[PDB]
Design a protein around this ligand. Sequence first.
Ligand SMILES: O=c1ccn([C@@H]2O[C@H](COP(=O)(O)OP(=O)(O)OP(=O)(O)O)[C@@H](O)[C@H]2O)c(=O)[nH]1
Ligand SMILES: O=c1ccn([C@@H]2O[C@H](COP(=O)(O)OP(=O)(O)OP(=O)(O)O)[C@@H](O)[C@H]2O)c(=O)[nH]1
Lengths: 364, 401, 401
Amino acid sequence: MKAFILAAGSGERLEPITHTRPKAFVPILSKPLIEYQIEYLRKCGIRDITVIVSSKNKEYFEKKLKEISIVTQKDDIKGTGAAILSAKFNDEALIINGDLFFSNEKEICNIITLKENAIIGVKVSNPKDYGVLVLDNQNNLSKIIEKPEIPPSNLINAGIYKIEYEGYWMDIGKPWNIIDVNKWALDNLVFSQNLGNVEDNVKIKGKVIIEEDAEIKSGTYIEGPVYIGKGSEIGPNSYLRPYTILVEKNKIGASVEVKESVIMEGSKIPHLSYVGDSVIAEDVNFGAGTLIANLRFDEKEVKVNVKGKRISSGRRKLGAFIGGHVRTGINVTILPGVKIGAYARIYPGAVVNRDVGYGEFFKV
Amino acid sequence: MKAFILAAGSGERLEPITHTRPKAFVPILSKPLIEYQIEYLRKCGIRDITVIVSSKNKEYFEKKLKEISIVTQKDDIKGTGAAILSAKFNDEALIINGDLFFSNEKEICNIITLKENAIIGVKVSNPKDYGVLVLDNQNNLSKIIEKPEIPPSNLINAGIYKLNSDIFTYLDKISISERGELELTDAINLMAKDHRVKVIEYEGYWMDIGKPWNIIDVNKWALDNLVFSQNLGNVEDNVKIKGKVIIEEDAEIKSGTYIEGPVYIGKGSEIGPNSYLRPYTILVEKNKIGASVEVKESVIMEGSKIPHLSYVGDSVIAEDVNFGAGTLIANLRFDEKEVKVNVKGKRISSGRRKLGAFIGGHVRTGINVTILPGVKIGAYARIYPGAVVNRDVGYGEFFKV
Amino acid sequence: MKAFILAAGSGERLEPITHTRPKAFVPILSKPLIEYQIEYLRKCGIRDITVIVSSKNKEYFEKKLKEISIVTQKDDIKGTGAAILSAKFNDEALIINGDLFFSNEKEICNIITLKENAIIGVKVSNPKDYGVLVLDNQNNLSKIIEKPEIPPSNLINAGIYKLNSDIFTYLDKISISERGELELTDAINLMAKDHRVKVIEYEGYWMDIGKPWNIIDVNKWALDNLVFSQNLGNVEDNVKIKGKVIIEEDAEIKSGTYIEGPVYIGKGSEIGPNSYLRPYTILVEKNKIGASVEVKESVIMEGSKIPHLSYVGDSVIAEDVNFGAGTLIANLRFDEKEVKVNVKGKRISSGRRKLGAFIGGHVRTGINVTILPGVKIGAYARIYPGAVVNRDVGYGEFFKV
Ligand SMILES: O=c1ccn([C@@H]2O[C@H](COP(=O)(O)OP(=O)(O)OP(=O)(O)O)[C@@H](O)[C@H]2O)c(=O)[nH]1
Ligand SMILES: O=c1ccn([C@@H]2O[C@H](COP(=O)(O)OP(=O)(O)OP(=O)(O)O)[C@@H](O)[C@H]2O)c(=O)[nH]1
């Protein structure tokens, strides 16, 4: 049985994260999204896995993977969903959307035994987004109607094609979903351990994962669940609160407080800062005194521009989404929902009250 | 013996605190000002206590007070005089101003034995405010001069009276004052021209809570005199504690916190990790103090939260306030002169070299807010992130630059 | 053998430090620069030491030094040449530039035995600044070329001379230089045309303190070489200490403090609670470092205080300074190019990728002040709360936006 993972989108809705990485390598704890997919396919025995990507997303993927077939897309644009065609298979195949996270693999294992065409569906609370599966009287696919303002049922297209899905399901469309899955993963996929190094006068409570070569210095105080990734350097006198995820080689410093945030590879928050309910991408540097607001005065849900459309995040508390290789000056101030583009620089003292462009030098 | 507490001012001079509570419920440690009064009256045996309030806030008082008589004032005319006109007594009564804090009750106990009209006087360093008692050659009340500028003595009206039904006569005689009010003090002045009106000098600690920095004053004094080192709450390891520290029940204090007394930590409060409470920090109830937050000589009222990266010095923060991360208060002027505060539109020295801010109830500050010395921020205000607050801020104001 | 220390420059290049002290009293750890000089002279036995200063600051030097000879410079004519014209010596003398720090004294000891004119030279990486010594075929002084651009060798003038009375002759011969000064180097250049003038190469550590970041340079070196882990002070529990840490007497260090050496904590200082001193923190004397304050690679001079919520990196803060809560120093530029500093009105690279600020004596910053890399702030300045300091700030300036 062949299998295909459909990347090749350009996750615009997941900017600024996707300015610098394909959505396939969105980190969930230590591992990129696509690795979970490959991993769970192999638990069904699949072995021959191909990823449909776009040049010049073309690898990248090659650098990152890893004994797997990388094949590009061509060449009009639409689908659905692609194209599709760039995949070469005779007989059957397993097609899986490359922006899915799913917990168990059991329904994929089950679906590949069948010789009829079959697809997986999943129940959700918000079927008015996603494509709803309408079934006939013998529970086969009548049609997939999409955006149906008037949703016939709660059963939607789970995006695995060759059955109702059981476990945890999430597509990573908008940036705050990066928080969603990472919270879930920290709750479900990993367990209290310490392969790193912790000094005296460090308080630790609840589920705390400390990976190898991670240093945690005196005065630090950790309230779980927390994930501290390999090579990270915490403290002295840091404070990590529940659902802090530091994916790899992160610097958290004196008088710095993190909460319910995903902070990606190599990013550093060295002094006098509070990061709440945020996603900070790779190789970011916060200047001393950089602060993120995560609550609006009226306590209404924080809104975010996603493809130029102003949209509720469904979160009462949401911070910022910082792109890769951003540097903030000292005493920077960032407002709720704000997106800051990859490679931006925020001039000292700035109050960031609007989205900031790729490469922008935002100085007042 | 009946007793009346006069509590139907709108304490304008105590704004912003009084935007959201009657001055009678200004917290001194865990207890409201009026409760100390009722408490100390009962130590004299008084039992029948009535509070003259203004409808509305009639009702408030009803919610808060339990088996004490709540009676409103007549809505036409204002004044302490107008207040007892709504008071029904009898023969004698004990009248006490509802903005007073006094330590011992001994002179009230003493004064209520006499059957002459008598009032209590008290020596202060600034008699040019308050009403000065001028006495005759036999130490009875000649007259009460209001804010004399040329003060005959230091002995001023302590605002505890024992008075007979005759005052109601003199209350009709006298008419409205310069500020549009029916001053009881005028009535007493006629009464002393005369009944013989006896003037008992007060011994202990005395303070009226007129201006907002007096909230700090009494609370320091209470922490120094009325309570003693204890811990009914929970303290983690690596918490340093020095001096007088009171930790009330259900109060959590987390590792890294460092406390230099005297400090009062009220019930339900959550301190740390890595907080720093310095001398005369008063957290009245259910306060959140967080990582890299430092408090000093400040009264922080019910339910207010300072969760990150802030310094609060020499300030009064009222109830259900929220400081955004990085909110700072300045408490010293560049020239080190005494910090000035606008009180009823008048710019006035606080007598303090170090004074921070007075924040009203339900204020929220954004992150990286910066507040200057002496500033008043009105109840329900919102300060925009990054704002520099260099002027008083209105009730409800969205101050955004 | 007489000796003269030349200390009558303006040290303009070392502003703002020199607004309030002569360069001779730039602190290197606990001791002023000149004391190291005197100290190391005496290790050669010299005993009769004179310092050529500028009246006033005559001044000063008298208050700080006895009984070392203090002698002013004369006639509204400047220069090292003008300096020794005020120096009175028959026969020989040792002349040493009063802005030098040198580790060993061995070459001075050696040079004073000779009876020829001799000077010390020293190899450096940047000989295009400084005066290069060109030697003849028998290693005596051919000439000193000033800032050659095409540097013949790496061997430059170390600014220690042994000279005979003959120099006074050559001092009258030569006349004013391009920059309006009487250069002693010109006199020595004539003298070498010739007396035979011997050039001894210097061995150890050598540094002139011309620009403000050199204060950091020597202080790092001193902390690495001249002092060793000890604790004559007091340290509370939950204080972490790593690496070389010097704690002088009457210094208090409170719980939560975390120290990563090498660090020097001068006498009388008060650290913590929850402070964080990182490598090459030098607190020279009586310094206050407070909660949620972090210092790094910085020299912080007598009596200065950083009490709350601040980060000082790669900076020099002079005496009796006060940083308001939330005062931050930026030490890195966005492009990571070397930080530039105005030095005598010329914009100049510091050679440092990471450089913070140079704060003059008696400066006060308001809360939430924000200071940019390379910035100089003049003595006695005041920075208004919330200000972003993005330019040099004047002596006495009230910088408010
Ligand atoms: O109409 C009134 C006026 C005053 N009082 C009561 O008399 C006592 C002393 O009355 P004050 O004369 O101090 O009036 P005030 O408290 O409203 O002062 P401002 O800050 O508004 O200037 C206070 O406890 C007050 O409640 C009344 O009961 N009714
Ligand atoms: O007129 C002078 C000038 C300089 N000197 C002293 O001789 C040595 C050589 O001084 P330099 O002539 O090399 O310059 P400078 O160090 O004075 O530079 P500024 O930072 O002051 O601009 C220095 O230690 C200085 O103090 C004098 O004695 N007299």
